Amino acid sequence: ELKETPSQTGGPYVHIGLLPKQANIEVFEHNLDNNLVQDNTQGQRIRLEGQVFDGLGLPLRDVLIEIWQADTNGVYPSQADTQGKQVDPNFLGWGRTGADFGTGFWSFNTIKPGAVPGRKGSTQAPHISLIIFARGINIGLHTRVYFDDEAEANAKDPVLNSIEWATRRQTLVAKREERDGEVVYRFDIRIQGENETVFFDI
Amino acid sequence: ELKETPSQTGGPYVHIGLLPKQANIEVFEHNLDNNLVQDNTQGQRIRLEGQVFDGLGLPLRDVLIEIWQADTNGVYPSQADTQGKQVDPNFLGWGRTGADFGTGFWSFNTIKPGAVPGRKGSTQAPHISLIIFARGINIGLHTRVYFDDEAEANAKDPVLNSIEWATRRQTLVAKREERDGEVVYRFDIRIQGENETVFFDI
Amino acid sequence: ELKETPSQTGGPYVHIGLLPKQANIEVFEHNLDNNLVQDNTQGQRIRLEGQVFDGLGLPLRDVLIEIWQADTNGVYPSQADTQGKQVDPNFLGWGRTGADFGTGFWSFNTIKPGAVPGRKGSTQAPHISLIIFARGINIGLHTRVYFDDEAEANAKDPVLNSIEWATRRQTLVAKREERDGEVVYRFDIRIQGENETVFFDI
Amino acid sequence: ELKETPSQTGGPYVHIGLLPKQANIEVFEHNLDNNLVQDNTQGQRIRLEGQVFDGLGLPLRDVLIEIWQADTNGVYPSQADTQGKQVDPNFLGWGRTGADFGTGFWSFNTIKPGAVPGRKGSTQAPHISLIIFARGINIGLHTRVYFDDEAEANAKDPVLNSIEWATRRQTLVAKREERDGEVVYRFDIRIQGENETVFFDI
Amino acid sequence: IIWGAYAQRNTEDHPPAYAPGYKTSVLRSPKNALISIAETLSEVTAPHFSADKFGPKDNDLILNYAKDGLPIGERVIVHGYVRDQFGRPVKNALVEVWQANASGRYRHPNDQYIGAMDPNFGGCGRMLTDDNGYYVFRTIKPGPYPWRNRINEWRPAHIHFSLIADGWAQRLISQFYFEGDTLIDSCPILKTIPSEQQRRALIALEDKSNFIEADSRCYRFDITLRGRRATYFENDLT
Amino acid sequence: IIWGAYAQRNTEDHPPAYAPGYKTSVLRSPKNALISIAETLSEVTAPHFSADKFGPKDNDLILNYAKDGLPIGERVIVHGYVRDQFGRPVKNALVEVWQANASGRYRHPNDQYIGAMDPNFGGCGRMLTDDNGYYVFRTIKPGPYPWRNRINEWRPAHIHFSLIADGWAQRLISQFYFEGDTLIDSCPILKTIPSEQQRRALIALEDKSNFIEADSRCYRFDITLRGRRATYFENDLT
Amino acid sequence: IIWGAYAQRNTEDHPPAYAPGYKTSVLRSPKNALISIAETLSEVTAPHFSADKFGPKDNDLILNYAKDGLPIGERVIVHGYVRDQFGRPVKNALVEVWQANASGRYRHPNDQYIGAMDPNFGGCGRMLTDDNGYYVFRTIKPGPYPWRNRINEWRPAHIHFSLIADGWAQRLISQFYFEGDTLIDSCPILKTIPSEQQRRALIALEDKSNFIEADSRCYRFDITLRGRRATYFENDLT
Amino acid sequence: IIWGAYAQRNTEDHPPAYAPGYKTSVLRSPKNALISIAETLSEVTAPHFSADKFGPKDNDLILNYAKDGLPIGERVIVHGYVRDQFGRPVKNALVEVWQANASGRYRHPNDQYIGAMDPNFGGCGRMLTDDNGYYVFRTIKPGPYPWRNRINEWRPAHIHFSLIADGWAQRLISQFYFEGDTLIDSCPILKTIPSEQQRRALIALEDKSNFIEADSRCYRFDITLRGRRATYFENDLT
Ligand SMILES: [Fe+3]
Ligand SMILES: [Fe+3]
Ligand SMILES: [Fe+3]
Ligand SMILES: [Fe+3]
């Protein structure tokens, strides 16, 4: 048996390799980005946005974020999904973005995911899996984003209920807003300190 | 010379072995508990109660607490007490309790201890020695409970005066209340954080 | 190159795993046993029976025996048989039995095997290969059973003729009897001592 | 923990030290011998006699034998006997003898022992514990002598029944004879070979 | 002989309070250093428990909760000596133990592991050491216990124990393990102890000569408590 | 490829028949040397068993005999590969196993040990290796078993196994043990094997990465059978 | 084959979050312990990227940004295999890399080092592993990079890399170094990894036989991701 | 304290019965294995001998047979302790010894060696151990003894000894040798013991500080007998 290759920080220039357009580098014809909605993608369009804060309460302006989620019917566009259901064919389920260098705001255009089966016949509440990389972070930090308008489903979610400190569950719930008829969920991440966001070992 | 056996946490099921009735196990005819008052015990009856909080401000619902104290005349019911005075014969001086699984409240029924000699001719203020064991605590945490109505004696206590940060001395003073004519001292313990309770290496 | 896994005794409870019905254990729907004759099996039906004796002349009442043999035309029901002839399709060629716990008698219901090719164009006399496992036996003991009514074939058998002590060849010849019109061959095995049965390293 | 001192043979001159009179040496006023009957000893007087044979069937003429047994009521004259019953006060329970240098016959004058409790509420049949030392024997050989007129008790004896080869149990049964009105039990010991006497690891 | 104070606890011989690999310790460990005090009568005294109130099976975990039959599992005797750091026997100390059953299942309301419960096993016992500091109890060897620290964490088989002896300063709760268990090298709880020699002090040793034929195996485990110094000059305790 | 005979069994890699420290072997061992023969079709063939006749729980000792509940004891998975001495996989070989329960008690009429019987455990299983020579079964870890060789003899925890593979010459019955068991060094049965390296070949290894969280531990144990040589010149087998 | 969960990440094989010698980690590390969860479909799935959308020079850092001429610096090929912890190849995984130029200068708005920029070098590439888990890219060896941790801190020459493979749980970003660089022993970032053997797992090895005469040198670097266990009994994932 | 059975004899710590290099053992060794039994009162009891019946010179081999003068040879005192395997003293055990004279000649009818007989030496003694398990006797150091095993076999100087102690199971006869004798390494009788450490346990050590000036040398030799276990649960002996 082999040991996993050890993690190292992404460093402050993580955008050269993962978002070259943000570093002003045009080498690729096709670039990966933060827009998961294609014209024929099914589902409710939402914008997910927020900032990431350090232990002094200041935003990280060099953080890189990725999300992974299921389609509108709760099916992942992955060969490892075993549900036997057809996935939306116009959905990658993944995106990557970087915080703005001046403000620290980050955003994704995506679709609100459908509920996905949990272990042993349970049902998970709708959620997006998110990972954060940046200078100072030695291993990507994993968290999940749930939605405040899915109160009933959240109350029954296996993962949220497995956090024994009930007060910390709320750090994983994004707040629904409606800017111009666009549905926006605000999700701020606090890496350290008061109201520190829950991070998982997955 | 030998080294002391190293400590290990009591773990979350510490009640199976130390308070089997709280775990619903009836193996012993005589059980140890939190009532130190026998019918003929001398002294003022008091109830000592409180909660233990973790670093998030949440109560520990799996903590086990024990107390050790002198009788009403400040004599310990121990062969190692060298005062040459007779101890109350109907007093064990020790008790054990567990926090309630749902609320975290713990309590003891005991007697208010008399003052005990300190080192080098000094006099200690009335106090109860307390130890805390629980999941997450690697070595039992020792503290003492003094009483707020013993202002004069506390001001002169050798141990309280040996804490150089004066502001922390107050964490060891229980507050006297009178519920139904019963005298109750409330003593909350904060293991970590703001207003953290003083713990001793004895 | 690897070394063969070393042998260890089967121990006295070898029936739990190899003949669970003899140990009174019903876990399997289909069980392996000592009857090699199916309704359509071709050939002369015979019963092979006997006892196994230790060095004091006492029967082993905890011995497990297996046999391996060819069909009536001398073809093994094995993919490794290279004769190019069709084997009887209703014949496993193998069976397992245990001695009776009280008497030590063991038995198999089978068919008298046809002659099988020997090395270098020779012909072996009809025989059944037998192995014995038991408490006290560190490695399964291999032997062969020939038949006393096949005098001519035995006289020419390559394996019997390779035993240089001629007197020991007779220990491998079973005696034909006729109980009720049933043909029975009696084969007693003497593990140690006078008239010790020949055992092979195969 | 320490290991037992390893055994070594007694050698051919074992009588110099254990039966000096047999070697013609008068150094001790009081000598140990083969007569366990004192004038007031209680019980039926018997003579136990026999020979010890080697693997060629020849008697050992240099063997030393000792016996250890209970009194007539089955109580050992030992502080380790826990029966709470009074032992015959005129009984040592032990004796030592050597085979005759010319013939190999050995003998003891003793009393027929009463039955002794076995483990877990059982009852042992009357028996004498015997040990043999000699040139060629690296560790004293332990055996027991039972009596043929105690058929019923022998049938129920825990130790005899623990010998799984039933045929060997008879090697431990002495034969009662009546020479001149004297009761004699003949017990021959065969160290090796056919009808080898059972020896125990006690 | 006039007794003085217990020798100082050697903090390097014990786990620290904050041990990040044992996750639950992160929020249950003081941020401030412990305040060391000079001992008084409060610290050098302790309660006395009477032998008369102990039941006959209090130290027999195989029978003290058996109802319809015997518990299932490996029959073992555990024995040893309790002494102080200067090698003196600790007499009449109260020793309490608790453990899981043969499946690694605890009889506790908060334990949901799938390993089977044993209706004839309780899992707790107690006893007083004798005048030589000797103790002996019998039990069923506990099975290893999976738990959530990292997701696939497994405790080696272990028995929890607690001692209340002569001085309150000697109060101690710990756990002991069984010689040869391969999980001992992976346990984050055992790894909170900083030194290898102290981790080995918690391993009970197979005691072959004390096995009882066709009945029970035996493990030997000695415990060392803090010890008192004697005073020959000024007596400042009082 | 034309196959020739199996390579000779290396007698120095196996216990001898007469092994005085294992008492029962004294009267059950031949006085004469074994007679070695050159192999024929009889020795190079073996039966075939069909996958269709195996039940769904034949390799699950935890459930194949459970009636009212689950057996008590340590939940473990055992897996590994069966290969021949030249490293080739042994496909579709019949592997049968049997063992005691968690108390060290066998469900056998002749076992009177006092360790408790488990009404939900049978103790036998079987399976066929796959095309890669892989096998997997699940069971309860057996407890050590006292027996009468010397009066206080104790077997280390062990599982008995048997293989019927491609050639009758490969027929083998043995036993495997569990990494770290201290009784392994004292066992007279394991000591009949003359070499230390062969004694180690019977020890199943803890396989931590394959443990199933909050469920079962896992041990890895590979088995090597005799292997056939290929023929490139005269074919004398027939 | 029915797949179960990925094996647990071994936290002792990775740097801790809080590593004071790497200053930026002090305010960007959680105070709370990570909460371990049992895996679901969310953790065992991951996206698929199509080979059709990759350009012909995406893995050729020497030419993918060259305008007027070739970049200045040492021409090197880097190749290797990506496998999971059980040794199975990781097929079609997305591998992205980025690095400084030959001067140790990054083409990034926030890099003000005085080492010269190279107008013909971009510093990023990507590729998909093949069916054997093999990847190959060509680039200019990066120069060491001074940075402000302590005032005179210098990173050894290194290439940053990222993998998105079969399961989200395998997601990994790290950096690899070049055999023999003396700065490797002084780097505070490499020193966040606790064990020497894991620090060595990030060093690419000179592969002399694969150098291309009068053209390019070659380094070999293999990567190991977490691996999935197979399920043979209950399937609880769903 | 309730005593249980003696611990099992460790057969590997003793010579086997059949030891071909000691020729006489070939026809005087059982072919069958010994049958081990569980102990009863018969095995745990033993006789008591009274101190009153011992003469004043029973432990003085120099004077107990002297008639006209003192025996010729080396004056030596031998002393030591008899304990059980758990280190407890063996009180009032009967210790008997016998040996050859200074010429290596035994006063026995069957000894025809040419070494001279000593009219003032007998060669046997006895004593009871005291409450500390101590014994002391004085004698003439015996000379080595040629004998017919192979034609030129020679025993190292040795003293034969026998113990009857508390339990019949402790019954033991052995021989001890003298530090430095070169014949110890060649003796087939000493070589029946399988382990080197056990062969050394029979060598008496020169005890220089206990030599008596202008009179006698001194050797120290301790003996270990089997020991009893204590019972704390069921008492099955009866
Ligand atoms: Fe960099
Ligand atoms: Fe525990
Ligand atoms: Fe077995
Ligand atoms: Fe001698």
- The pairing of beta strand A128-133 with beta strand A52-53: unpaired
Nearest of F75, B53, B55 to residue G31 by alpha carbon: B55
Does B have 3 or more CB contacts under 8 Å with E? yes
Nearest of F221, F230, F77 to residue F163 by alpha carbon: F221
HEC letters along chain F: CEEEEECCCCHHHCCCCCCCCCHHHHHCCCCCCCEECCCCHHHHCCCCCCHHHCCCCCCECCCCCCCCCCCCCCEEEEEEEEEECCCCECCCCEEEEECCCCCCCCCCCCCCCCCCCCCCCCCEEEEECCCCCEEEEEEECCCCEEECCCCCEEECCEEEEEEECCCHHHCEEEEEEECCCHHHHCCCCHHHCCCHHHHHCCEEEECHHHCECCCEEEEECCEEECCEEEECCCCCCC
- The pairing of beta strand G94-98 with beta strand G124-128: antiparallel
| Direct distance between the N- and C-terminal alpha carbons of chain B, in angstroms, rounded to an integer | 20
- All residues of chain E having their beta carbon less than 8 Å from the beta carbon of residue H7 are 209-210
Distance F185 CA to ligand 3 centre (A): 16
Chain D nearest CA to H231, separation (Å): 14
Q: Are H13 and H51 in contact (CB under 8 A)?
A: no
| CA-based R_g, chain D, Å | 17
Residues D34, D38, D42, D47, Cα dihedral to 10°? 30
Q: Which tokens go with E8?
A: 């100082």
- Verify whether the Cβ–Cβ distance F65 to C78 is below 8 Å: no
H or E stretch including D18? helix D14-18
List the subunits that have 3+ CB pairs under 8 angstroms with B. Answer: A, E
Contacts (Cβ under 8 Å, ≥6 apart) of D82: H41, H237, H238
Per the listing, tokens 């039940």 go with F55
Known catalytic residues of E? Answer: 106, 145, 155, 158, 160
What Cα–Cα distance (Å) separates residue H220 from each residue in E17, G47, H59, H185? Answer: 54, 82, 16, 20
For the beta carbon of residue G206, count every other beta carbon within 10 angstroms.
14
- Verify whether the Cβ–Cβ distance G38 to E149 is below 8 Å: no
CA atoms within 13 A on the CB side of F229: 13
Listed by number, the residues of chain G in 11-50 with a beta carbon closer than 8 Å to a beta carbon of chain E are 11-12, 16, 31-33, 36-38
Q: Phi, psi at residue H131, to the nearest 5°?
A: -70, -15
Chain A nearest CA to B130, separation (Å): 26
Q: Measured between alpha carbons, how far is G190 from E63 in angstroms, rounded to an integer? A: 57
G56 touches chain A (CB under 8 A): no
Q: Measured between alpha carbons, how far is G117 from G113 in angstroms, rounded to an integer? A: 9
H232 annotated to bind ligand: no
Q: Measured between alpha carbons, how far is A107 from A100 in angstroms, rounded to an integer? A: 9
3-state secondary structure of B55: coil
Q: Measured between alpha carbons, how far is A119 from A113 in angstroms, rounded to an integer? A: 18
**Residue F211 structural domain:** 1-238
Query: Residue G140 burial by CB count (10 A; 0-12/13-18/19+): exposed, middle or buried?
Result: buried
Chains E and H form CB pairs within 8 A to the count of: 19
Per the listing, tokens 């108390």 go with F103
- Verify whether the Cβ–Cβ distance E26 to G16 is below 8 Å: no
HEC letters along F19-83: CCCCHHHHHCCCCCCCEECCCCHHHHCCCCCCHHHCCCCCCECCCCCCCCCCCCCCEEEEEEEEE
H or E stretch including H53? none
Domain boundaries, chain A: 1-202
H142: CATH: 2.60.130.10
Catalytic residue among H105, H155, H226, H228: H155
3-state secondary structure of A20: helix
Does D have 3 or more CB contacts under 8 Å with C? yes
Distance B152 CA to ligand 3 centre (A): 74
Q: Which tokens go with E197?
A: 């020699």
Nearest of B42, B61, B83 to residue B135 by alpha carbon: B61
Q: Are G6 and G39 in contact (CB under 8 A)?
A: yes
Q: Are A39 and A105 in contact (CB under 8 A)?
A: no
To test the contact with chain H by mutation, choose from E59, E76, E77, E212 the residue with the greatest count of H C-beta atoms within 10 A, namely E212
Nearest of G215, G158, G209 to residue G183 by alpha carbon: G158
Does H have 3 or more CB contacts under 8 Å with E? yes
Q: Measured between alpha carbons, how far is C127 from G5 in angstroms, rounded to an integer? A: 53
Q: Measured between alpha carbons, how far is G200 from G185 in angstroms, rounded to an integer? A: 11
Query: Residue G86 burial by CB count (10 A; 0-12/13-18/19+): exposed, middle or buried?
Result: middle
3-state secondary structure of G159: strand
What Cα–Cα distance (Å) separates residue C172 from each residue in C200, D54, F90? Answer: 11, 35, 32
Q: Measured between alpha carbons, how far is G13 from E85 in angstroms, rounded to an integer? A: 38
Q: How was this structure determined?
A: X-ray
To test the contact with chain E by mutation, choose from B8, B96, B162 the residue with the greatest count of E C-beta atoms within 10 A, namely B8
Q: Are B12 and E179 in contact (CB under 8 A)?
A: no
Distance H175 CA to ligand 4 centre (A): 8
Q: Measured between alpha carbons, how far is H216 from H74 in angstroms, rounded to an integer? A: 8
Distance H144 CA to ligand 4 centre (A): 9
H or E stretch including E44? helix E41-44
CA angle G178–A7–G186, rounded 5-degree value? 50
Instruction: List the beta bridge partners of residue H98.
Output: H124, H160
Q: Which ligand is nearest to the CA of G154?
A: 1
H or E stretch including D17? helix D14-18
Distance H155 CA to ligand 4 centre (A): 7
- The pairing of beta strand E203-206 with beta strand E172-178: parallel
Q: Which tokens go with B115?
A: 């003052």
Q: How many residues does chain G have?
A: 238
Q: Which tokens go with A137?
A: 């972070």
Chain G nearest CA to F156, separation (Å): 28
Q: Measured between alpha carbons, how far is B137 from A162 in angstroms, rounded to an integer? A: 21
G85 touches chain F (CB under 8 A): yes
Q: Measured between alpha carbons, how far is C195 from C187 in angstroms, rounded to an integer? A: 13
List the subunits that have 3+ CB pairs under 8 angstroms with C. Answer: D, F
Nearest of A129, A60, A95 to residue G29 by alpha carbon: A60
Q: Measured between alpha carbons, how far is H177 from H205 in angstroms, rounded to an integer? A: 9
Q: Are H127 and H68 in contact (CB under 8 A)?
A: no
Stated resolution in angstroms: 1.8
CA atoms within 13 A on the CB side of E102: 30
- All residues of chain E having their beta carbon less than 8 Å from the beta carbon of residue G37 are 151
Q: Measured between alpha carbons, how far is F93 from F85 in angstroms, rounded to an integer? A: 15
List the subunits that have 3+ CB pairs under 8 angstroms with D. Answer: C, H
What Cα–Cα distance (Å) separates residue A58 from each residue in A10, A62, A195, F94? Answer: 19, 12, 14, 66
Nearest of F129, F62, F134 to residue F102 by alpha carbon: F62
Alpha helices in C58-192 (DSSP H): 151-155, 166-169
Q: Measured between alpha carbons, how far is E39 from B200 in angstroms, rounded to an integer? A: 11
- The pairing of beta strand B200-201 with beta strand E35-36: parallel
The total number of structural domains in chain H stands at 1
CATH topology for B1-202 is Protocatechuate 3,4-Dioxygenase, subunit A (2.60.130)
Q: Write b or e for each residue in H177-191: b if 16 or more Cβ atoms lie within 10 A of its Cβ, otherwise e.
A: bbeebebbeebbbbe
Q: Measured between alpha carbons, how far is B98 from H229 in angstroms, rounded to an integer? A: 41
Kindly state the DSSP code that residue E216 receives in the 8-state scheme: B
